[PDB]
Amino acid sequence: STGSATTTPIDSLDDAYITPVQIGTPAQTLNLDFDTGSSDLWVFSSETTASEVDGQTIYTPSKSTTAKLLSGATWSISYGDGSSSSGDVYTDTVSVGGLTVTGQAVESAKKVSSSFTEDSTIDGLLGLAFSTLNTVSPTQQKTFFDNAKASLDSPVFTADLGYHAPGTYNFGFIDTTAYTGSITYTAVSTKQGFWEWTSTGYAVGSGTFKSTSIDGIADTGTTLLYLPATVVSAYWAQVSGAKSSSSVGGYVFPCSATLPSFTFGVGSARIVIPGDYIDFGPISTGSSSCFGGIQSSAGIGINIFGDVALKAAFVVFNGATTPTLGFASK
């Protein structure tokens, strides 16, 4: 079997991407944030505290004739960005672009932090990292991808995020028309439960490519590109007036600037991120200072190849016996 769904930016800055998911019987369509950096499928629901719901579509397990309460199971998750959510668990039928999983754990939220409440367009998350990170206790649950893998034509999912435009998440197949040139595959470590790979280096604009090992994760659930301070400083040093601001919490640059591109290595291949992808608009409404799309991972502990980097590429998440990551230009 296969599945194909359109993913769309939630706003004019591509701050996140939402993809419709059908849950239950009859179908209840929620727009979820497909997250390759986490492993819980969780949703805003009829059980979420009234004050913590602001415009999101909710999942009502009681109106789903296939929803089964997973007895004594609870989930609680804290993300790198400080946001959190928690609640109880149902098993239900879940479909993504025509690919169906029966008995998928749907984690129903009782509590969400304010960061989730303020994003009216994000109805929950669909975790696509390795099932070892799943927070369901006392019995861990598998991801949608893990549940479908046996049924899939090929054990893969692809991420094709758009810049200021719609994109696609495909399951079970590789769309050979969605990229140019070839897909370069690279090794993956699943020890931390993430799609963790090693980039072979980088370049700023038309500068000479620097061969250096950058370990990081392919994370669709993180908006920006988080890299070592040496790397990020070399990038922002090319932007006139750019500086690291402690008040704003990152590198800012004049909104009138035309940014240089950023290239990252995948083996001997190169993915070029156009400069416009790195502009995240005014730091505050009406400001002529803009927020940068390339930030330092020094406070994080891990380098993150988020949407800023992934949207410049056609990305294959190969869930073969030994998982790997594929990247092609598009």
**Residues designated as active site:** 35, 199
Say if CB 126 and CB 19 are below 8 A apart: yes
- Taking the least distance from each CB to ligand NCCN1CCOCC1, the nearer of 41 and 136 is 41
Query: Is residue 53 involved in binding ligand NCCN1CCOCC1 (CB under 6 A)?
Result: no
88 in contact with ligand NCCN1CCOCC1 (CB under 6 A)? no
Choose the binding region for ligand NCCN1CCOCC1 from 115-123, 140-148, 242-250, 266-274 (rule: CB under 6 A). Answer: 115-123
Strand partners, 42: 107, 125
- Pick from 113, 115, 238, 324 the residue near ligand NCCN1CCOCC1 by CB under 6 A: 115
If the CB atoms of residues 73 and 159 are measured against ligand NCCN1CCOCC1, the closer one turns out to be 159
CB of 98 to ligand NCCN1CCOCC1, least distance (A): 27
**Per CB under 6 A, 118 contacts ligand NCCN1CCOCC1:** yes
Residue 188 backbone dihedrals phi, psi, to 5 degrees: -130, 135
| Joined tokens for residue 11 | 């706003």
Q: How many CB atoms lie within 10 A of CB 97?
A: 17
Using the rule CB under 6 A, is 279 a contact of ligand NCCN1CCOCC1? no
DSSP tally for the chain: helices H, then strands E: 4, 24
CB neighbourhood size of 48 (10 A): 23
16 binds ligand NCCN1CCOCC1 (CB under 6 A): yes
Residue 198 touches ligand NCCN1CCOCC1, criterion: CB under 6 A: no
Of 119 and 123, CB closest to ligand NCCN1CCOCC1: 119
The per-residue DSSP string of 219-269 comes to: -TT--SEEE-HHHHHHHHTTSTT-EEETTTTEEEEETT--PPPEEEEETTE
Q: Which is nearer to ligand NCCN1CCOCC1, 107 or 119 (CB)?
A: 119
Contact status: 119 vs ligand NCCN1CCOCC1 (CB under 6 A): yes
Q: Which two tokens stand for residue 53?
A: 């719901």
* 289 part of the interface to ligand NCCN1CCOCC1, by CB under 6 A: no
Of 118, 108, 128, nearest in space to 30 by CA? 108
Cα–Cα dist 282/157, whole Å: 34
Q: Which of 2, 4, 6, 15 is in the footprint of ligand NCCN1CCOCC1 by CB under 6 A?
A: 15
- Kindly give the pairing relationship between strand 279-282 and strand 313-318: unpaired
Q: Between β-strands 124-127 and 28-35, what pairing exists: parallel, antiparallel or unpaired? A: parallel
Q: Give the interface with ligand NCCN1CCOCC1 as residue ranges (CB under 6 A).
A: 15-16, 115, 118-119
